[PDB]
Design a protein around this nucleic acid. Sequence first.
RNA 1: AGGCAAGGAGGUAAAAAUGU
RNA 2: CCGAGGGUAGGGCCCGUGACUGGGGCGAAGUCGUAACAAGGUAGCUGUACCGGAAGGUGCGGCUGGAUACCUCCUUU
RNA 3: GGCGACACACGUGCUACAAUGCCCACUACAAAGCGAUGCCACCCGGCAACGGGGAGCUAAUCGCAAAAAGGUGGGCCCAGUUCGGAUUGGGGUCUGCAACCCGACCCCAUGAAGCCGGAAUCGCUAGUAAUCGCGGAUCAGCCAUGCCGCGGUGAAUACG
RNA 4: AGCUAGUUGGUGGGGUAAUGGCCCACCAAGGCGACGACGGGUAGCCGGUCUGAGAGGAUGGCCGGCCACAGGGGCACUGAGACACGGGCCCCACUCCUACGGGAGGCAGCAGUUAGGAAUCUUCCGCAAUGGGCGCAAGCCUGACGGAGCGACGCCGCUUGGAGGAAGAAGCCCUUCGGGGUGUAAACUCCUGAACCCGGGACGAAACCCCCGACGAGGGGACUGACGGUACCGGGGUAAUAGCGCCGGCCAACUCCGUGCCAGCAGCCGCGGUAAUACGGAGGGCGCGAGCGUUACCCGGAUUCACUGGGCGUAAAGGGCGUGUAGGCGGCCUGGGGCGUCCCAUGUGAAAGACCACGGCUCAACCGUGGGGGAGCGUGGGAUACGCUCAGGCUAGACGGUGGGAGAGGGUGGUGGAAUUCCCGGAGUAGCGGUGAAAUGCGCAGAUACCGGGAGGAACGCCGAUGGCGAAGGCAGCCACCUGGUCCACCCGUGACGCUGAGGCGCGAAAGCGUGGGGAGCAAACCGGAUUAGAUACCCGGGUAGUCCACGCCCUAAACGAUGCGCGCUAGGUCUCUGGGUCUCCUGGGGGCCGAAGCUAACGCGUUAAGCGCGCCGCCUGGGGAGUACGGCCGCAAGGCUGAAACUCAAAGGAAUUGACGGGGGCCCGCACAAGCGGUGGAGCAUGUGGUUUAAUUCGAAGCAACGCGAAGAACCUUACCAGGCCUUGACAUGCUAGGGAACCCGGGUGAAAGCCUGGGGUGCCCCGCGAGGGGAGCCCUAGCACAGGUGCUGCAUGGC
RNA 5: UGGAGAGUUUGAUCCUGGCUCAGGGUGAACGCUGGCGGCGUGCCUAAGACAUGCAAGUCGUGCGGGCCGCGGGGUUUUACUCCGUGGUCAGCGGCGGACGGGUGAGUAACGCGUGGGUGACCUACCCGGAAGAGGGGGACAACCCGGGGAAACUCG
Lengths: 71, 59
Amino acid sequence: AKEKDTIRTEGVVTEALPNATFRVKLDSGPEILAYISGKMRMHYIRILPGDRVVVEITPYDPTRGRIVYRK
Amino acid sequence: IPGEGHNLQEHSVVLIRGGRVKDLPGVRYHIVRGVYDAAGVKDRKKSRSKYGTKKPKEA
RNA sequence: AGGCAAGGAGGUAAAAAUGU
RNA sequence: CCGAGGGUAGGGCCCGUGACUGGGGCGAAGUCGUAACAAGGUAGCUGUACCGGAAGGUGCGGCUGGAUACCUCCUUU
RNA sequence: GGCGACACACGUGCUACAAUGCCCACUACAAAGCGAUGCCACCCGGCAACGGGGAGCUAAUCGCAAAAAGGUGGGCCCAGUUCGGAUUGGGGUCUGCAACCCGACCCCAUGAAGCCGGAAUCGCUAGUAAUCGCGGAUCAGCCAUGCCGCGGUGAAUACG
RNA sequence: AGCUAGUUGGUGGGGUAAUGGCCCACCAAGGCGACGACGGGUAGCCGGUCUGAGAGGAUGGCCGGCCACAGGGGCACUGAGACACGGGCCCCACUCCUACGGGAGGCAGCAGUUAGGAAUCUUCCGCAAUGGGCGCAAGCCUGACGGAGCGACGCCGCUUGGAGGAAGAAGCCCUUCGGGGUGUAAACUCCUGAACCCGGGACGAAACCCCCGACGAGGGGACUGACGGUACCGGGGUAAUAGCGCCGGCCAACUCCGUGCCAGCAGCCGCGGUAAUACGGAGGGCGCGAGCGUUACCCGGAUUCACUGGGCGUAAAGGGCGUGUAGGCGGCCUGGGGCGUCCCAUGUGAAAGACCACGGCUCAACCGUGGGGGAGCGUGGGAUACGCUCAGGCUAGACGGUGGGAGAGGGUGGUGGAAUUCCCGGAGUAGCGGUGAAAUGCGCAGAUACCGGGAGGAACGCCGAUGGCGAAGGCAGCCACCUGGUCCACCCGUGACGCUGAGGCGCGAAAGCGUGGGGAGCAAACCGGAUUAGAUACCCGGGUAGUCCACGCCCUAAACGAUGCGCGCUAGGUCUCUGGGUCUCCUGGGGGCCGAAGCUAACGCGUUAAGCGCGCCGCCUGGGGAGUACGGCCGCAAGGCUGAAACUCAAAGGAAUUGACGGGGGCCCGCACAAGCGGUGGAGCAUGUGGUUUAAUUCGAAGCAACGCGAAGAACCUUACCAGGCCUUGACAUGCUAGGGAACCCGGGUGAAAGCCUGGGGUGCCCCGCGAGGGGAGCCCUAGCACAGGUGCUGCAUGGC
RNA sequence: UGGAGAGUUUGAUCCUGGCUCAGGGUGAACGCUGGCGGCGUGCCUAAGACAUGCAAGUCGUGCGGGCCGCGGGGUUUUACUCCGUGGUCAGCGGCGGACGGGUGAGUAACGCGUGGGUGACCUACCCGGAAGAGGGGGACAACCCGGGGAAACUCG
Ligand SMILES: [Mg+2]
Ligand SMILES: [Mg+2]
Ligand SMILES: [Mg+2]
Ligand SMILES: [Mg+2]
Ligand SMILES: [Mg+2]
Ligand SMILES: [Mg+2]
Ligand SMILES: [Mg+2]
Ligand SMILES: [Mg+2]
Ligand SMILES: [Mg+2]
Ligand SMILES: [Mg+2]
Ligand SMILES: [Mg+2]
Ligand SMILES: [Mg+2]
Ligand SMILES: [Mg+2]
Ligand SMILES: [Mg+2]
Ligand SMILES: [Mg+2]
Ligand SMILES: [Mg+2]
Ligand SMILES: [Mg+2]
Ligand SMILES: [Mg+2]
Ligand SMILES: [Mg+2]
Ligand SMILES: [Mg+2]
Ligand SMILES: [Mg+2]
Ligand SMILES: [Mg+2]
Ligand SMILES: [Mg+2]
Ligand SMILES: [Mg+2]
Ligand SMILES: [Mg+2]
Ligand SMILES: [Mg+2]
Ligand SMILES: [Mg+2]
Ligand SMILES: [Mg+2]
Ligand SMILES: [Mg+2]
Ligand SMILES: [Mg+2]
Ligand SMILES: [Mg+2]
Ligand SMILES: [Mg+2]
Ligand SMILES: [Mg+2]
Ligand SMILES: [Mg+2]
Ligand SMILES: [Mg+2]
Ligand SMILES: [Mg+2]
Ligand SMILES: [Mg+2]
Ligand SMILES: [Mg+2]
Ligand SMILES: [Mg+2]
Ligand SMILES: [Mg+2]
Ligand SMILES: [Mg+2]
Ligand SMILES: [Mg+2]
Ligand SMILES: [Mg+2]
Ligand SMILES: [Mg+2]
Ligand SMILES: [Mg+2]
Ligand SMILES: [Mg+2]
Ligand SMILES: [Mg+2]
Ligand SMILES: [Mg+2]
Ligand SMILES: [Mg+2]
Ligand SMILES: [Mg+2]
Ligand SMILES: [Mg+2]
Ligand SMILES: [Mg+2]
Ligand SMILES: [Mg+2]
Ligand SMILES: [Mg+2]
Ligand SMILES: [Mg+2]
Ligand SMILES: [Mg+2]
Ligand SMILES: [Mg+2]
Ligand SMILES: [Mg+2]
Ligand SMILES: [Mg+2]
Ligand SMILES: [Mg+2]
Ligand SMILES: [Mg+2]
Ligand SMILES: [Mg+2]
Ligand SMILES: [Mg+2]
Ligand SMILES: [Mg+2]
Ligand SMILES: [Mg+2]
Ligand SMILES: [Mg+2]
Ligand SMILES: [Mg+2]
Ligand SMILES: [Mg+2]
Ligand SMILES: [Mg+2]
Ligand SMILES: [Mg+2]
Ligand SMILES: [Mg+2]
Ligand SMILES: [Mg+2]
Ligand SMILES: [Mg+2]
Ligand SMILES: [Mg+2]
Ligand SMILES: [Mg+2]
Ligand SMILES: [Mg+2]
Ligand SMILES: [Mg+2]
Ligand SMILES: [Mg+2]
Ligand SMILES: [Mg+2]
Ligand SMILES: [Mg+2]
Ligand SMILES: [Mg+2]
Ligand SMILES: [Mg+2]
Ligand SMILES: [Mg+2]
Ligand SMILES: [Mg+2]
Ligand SMILES: [Mg+2]
Ligand SMILES: [Mg+2]
Ligand SMILES: [Mg+2]
Ligand SMILES: [Mg+2]
Ligand SMILES: [Mg+2]
Ligand SMILES: [Mg+2]
Ligand SMILES: [Mg+2]
Ligand SMILES: [Mg+2]
Ligand SMILES: [Mg+2]
Ligand SMILES: [Mg+2]
Ligand SMILES: [Mg+2]
Ligand SMILES: [Mg+2]
Ligand SMILES: [Mg+2]
Ligand SMILES: [Mg+2]
Ligand SMILES: [Mg+2]
Ligand SMILES: [Mg+2]
């Protein structure tokens, strides 16, 4: 079916976990371990804490975000 | 859970199938769809019997 | 004497984490 | 009398749970270093012993799955 | 209008810090290019850029164009200076519809930083480096000190 | 890993159908155990079933046999038979009624209920059959059985038509726009008629019973069907369910769009991070089809537990070595027994199944009949090669003797020098020490360097080897002693005494520990100094435990030849040590190096094989978890041996090959450094860039190989940017549709210009006509279309460069 | 009358090796789809519980007794009475209920399998044969009366 559902909200990069996973605190609030986007990985786009990044977030589990855009 | 979407909730009575999925570590089962709480992956036209989707009524 | 090596030494060898 | 079983006390075993407690596997871009792989920058690995944020280090011994050139003298053809 | 901003940084250049130099005056030697709405001789007006008149070429034939460092004569006399030329005020000239942002050039003035530059670092072995002019191409004009060329003078050193 | 006390054997007895410790009384003290007892876990067992080529591996549902058990646990009674599923007593647990004292129960009989569960059937008909029980018989029972029901739950059979029919309708899909595809598929004509309806209608059932015949044989009679009005037969008679999986590889079958490492798929590999033959859909195709898939389990594939049929140098894997017990294994000749072994005969191997043959259901599945086979085991006879055993002999193996060696073999008692260090004596003085440099450090309270003496520990240079010895661990001064192995020659003796070796005992480097000494050097820890980002480390200066000995324990190791031991075989060359010889050459025994055959994944191994064989032992069974836990054992402790699994990954790994790399090695080279001259960095300016600013300071170029670059010329243009004004088939190309005008020129107004609005002259061409006038070419102009335009994005789609 | 491999460690290879796949099968389950017939087959879990109906009876040719049945009468009747019978009801007796049916909890054991042994045995019914069946007595059910107990039942 492919559901259009996600929230394209931004956030501050709090902390770098392994893989390229980050606890990023959003515009609105809650910090979710957010993993980097595949696209980003492909174009080698690094992130460090102290950044403002676009983070696509799921309806099923609003706890695992996905860092979409290059900052 | 296979298929896109799921009316699967929390207190959902559901049938496991068995068959470890390669990716997710330590997940050795499935939910077979089209039984109890889990329902047919809606409007799959192709590989249906595997997703519990009842044959669509062609006009 | 030079040759070519056999063998003993003696000197060199010792100083290197930063991205897109 | 024997006796299913029960009681009383002691032991063993299994199951359930279990505070607390070890606790390992994985991970693409965590962190700290750089131990190891190129005399990997002090050969390594190795047993043990001691110490250390941590790989580790050092002792002793073991091993090779490790290694030997160039001038300048002396010992001689 | 902006690409030409500008608190800075960095990159390549250019010109300096002078006496082997500087400024002037005379005097000599190239190469290679380039030129017709072009190069522009020569003459006069201009401090000058330039202007006007104007021949010659269509180029080995006329031009550009003087080559510059050089040689000689003259001065300067060791200083922020006759070094150095930025910056800035004025006056011009040109080419273009037009130079405010934002042109080049001339002239008069102004005469800043800079007395050979730290760690570093670059280039180059022969006509090379260094130094000195000249030409082109883009081009109305030119921000070109760039680039591509061309000649002039002309080294040092390479133990290893 | 030990278990056992009615436990083991006896006598006596009881009990029983009967043996018996079955039980008891009394003795005796056994009995079983690594040929794995006891304990734990698990489980009905078998004929069979599946699977496998087979060996085997799984499994024991259904059918047949046997057991056990009928809520759990006892116990008897009755009987031919039970310790008794629908009998009894008792205790327990549960439900049921109770007038609370007490009783009633038992579906693991059929059916059903409920629970648990992914999941499993109808509260069916019948006694007609066959079997059961009873009874003279009639008959009565019979949830045995016969049938029916329900479940695609399996197997098998059949249907969803058949014949024709386009150089190919439509619809859908691809297309490179022609076409292809679906596809003779359909439509349509003809045919046949599953269904369905009407008529008929079973076989299964002839006995039991009665009569004649003796109530015997034998003959005749009469009755009886749950299924079922079913099967089937005759007639009638309509075109009359297709689905599910898959389509990257394995694996049969590909294209498009959606999608963009998302949503998803996945059995593994792995697809998805804008061209997805892997996701989702579409078409198309492939597979099967009343099914098709998935899950789970089993075997298979997996020679991946390897008996057939894997192995152990390096991949997991040889125990650290001895010496041995059990066991396994065993040289040559003769003779018996004949246990193994083979053969023959027969008995057994039930039935079903499975194998074959035929037969019956319209075929088949299914079933029936008949045959055969059969691992095994029993008995009778035989055979003697092998194995076994007993007897005898033999010398090839093994051990022994006589003679002789070689040796760092082991222990013990000594002792000899060098060196270090210290003390003391001298003489002498400003440092020594150390390092890549240094610094702590010690030094005029006189160190270092030097000689004289003493003290003391410890190690044993040269010989020294690539050597020797040992079973390893290991072992080096020299001497003496005790003593181990070992080799040779002699073939003299014994006469198979052999080999291996689970356990066991012994040994077992270093470190460690315990008690006692000893302590020179050294040296963990520790304290200094440096080095450094840090330095718990290398480098230095010290320094304890330890190292040394004695006795006790620990046992590990890269205890490695990473190669278990033995014996036989299968080229040589070579160096070596050490014996023997008629000795510049043979023969033994070690230790190396290169190589035949062979082997080996290769590396390599190669008479000291990792070759060919045989014997015995150990071990392995993917990596990590992990040599970990847990248990057990051992140790005073550290810790050792033993030794998992859950989980987790698709590997981990060996050997080599190509590269890349190296603070490896050699040989080279370049303005690479050096030798030299000149600059850059510093000034100012010129330029380009970063940044920042801005409405925009277009866009690109990024270490070398971006940065006086694209730009070989930004005032406008350029210009790609921004502000604003405007233009829309549009500045530019090729056409349409039409509509009127149309070649061409000059304004005018507005405006910053552009643009917009608008005036006038201004039509000739091909012409036909006397003209009026008409049409079309060229050429623009207006409206909508085909379209242009995009310096707009992707150099990770590209060509070019 | 019998034996197939493939994918995957690497840049590539050979091997070691594991994992995975294709076959077959099942008491299966699940999904999707579903027309019929035959044949089998269907609680693999909780040997958890069980409502209701049946699942083991039968013999009057063992014998007694109750209730009704008719043929008769003795009996006017009302009895009873006598009997053959009819049938049922239990009782006693006899045989069967130990088979058949179920399940797989237990049990790793002579439980099972297999081949034997029994001078250590039994075997109702069935068959083959032999011999027999002479006499006497008795209690107990049913039945009757009497209680107990709420019932079940139960004693005298
Ligand atoms: Mg699929
Ligand atoms: Mg190292
Ligand atoms: Mg160590
Ligand atoms: Mg060492
Ligand atoms: Mg290894
Ligand atoms: Mg620019
Ligand atoms: Mg600077
Ligand atoms: Mg100054
Ligand atoms: Mg000066
Ligand atoms: Mg050169
Ligand atoms: Mg007796
Ligand atoms: Mg006993
Ligand atoms: Mg006794
Ligand atoms: Mg058990
Ligand atoms: Mg069991
Ligand atoms: Mg079994
Ligand atoms: Mg059975
Ligand atoms: Mg029960
Ligand atoms: Mg009971
Ligand atoms: Mg019982
Ligand atoms: Mg019974
Ligand atoms: Mg009983
Ligand atoms: Mg029993
Ligand atoms: Mg019952
Ligand atoms: Mg039942
Ligand atoms: Mg139910
Ligand atoms: Mg349920
Ligand atoms: Mg049934
Ligand atoms: Mg009936
Ligand atoms: Mg019968
Ligand atoms: Mg009767
Ligand atoms: Mg009945
Ligand atoms: Mg039946
Ligand atoms: Mg059927
Ligand atoms: Mg189904
Ligand atoms: Mg047809
Ligand atoms: Mg017809
Ligand atoms: Mg009919
Ligand atoms: Mg049709
Ligand atoms: Mg294919
Ligand atoms: Mg696939
Ligand atoms: Mg697809
Ligand atoms: Mg199936
Ligand atoms: Mg196998
Ligand atoms: Mg083998
Ligand atoms: Mg193997
Ligand atoms: Mg190994
Ligand atoms: Mg060994
Ligand atoms: Mg031995
Ligand atoms: Mg022996
Ligand atoms: Mg023999
Ligand atoms: Mg023997
Ligand atoms: Mg048979
Ligand atoms: Mg048969
Ligand atoms: Mg037939
Ligand atoms: Mg003998
Ligand atoms: Mg001897
Ligand atoms: Mg001797
Ligand atoms: Mg002294
Ligand atoms: Mg002899
Ligand atoms: Mg003899
Ligand atoms: Mg041993
Ligand atoms: Mg020691
Ligand atoms: Mg020291
Ligand atoms: Mg220190
Ligand atoms: Mg320090
Ligand atoms: Mg030290
Ligand atoms: Mg000690
Ligand atoms: Mg030791
Ligand atoms: Mg070694
Ligand atoms: Mg060793
Ligand atoms: Mg080893
Ligand atoms: Mg051994
Ligand atoms: Mg030796
Ligand atoms: Mg030799
Ligand atoms: Mg060969
Ligand atoms: Mg060799
Ligand atoms: Mg040799
Ligand atoms: Mg081998
Ligand atoms: Mg250990
Ligand atoms: Mg322990
Ligand atoms: Mg390797
Ligand atoms: Mg240089
Ligand atoms: Mg460059
Ligand atoms: Mg390219
Ligand atoms: Mg780019
Ligand atoms: Mg690997
Ligand atoms: Mg791979
Ligand atoms: Mg690969
Ligand atoms: Mg049926
Ligand atoms: Mg059951
Ligand atoms: Mg009766
Ligand atoms: Mg039975
Ligand atoms: Mg049943
Ligand atoms: Mg047991
Ligand atoms: Mg037996
Ligand atoms: Mg036995
Ligand atoms: Mg038997
Ligand atoms: Mg009886
Ligand atoms: Mg009597």
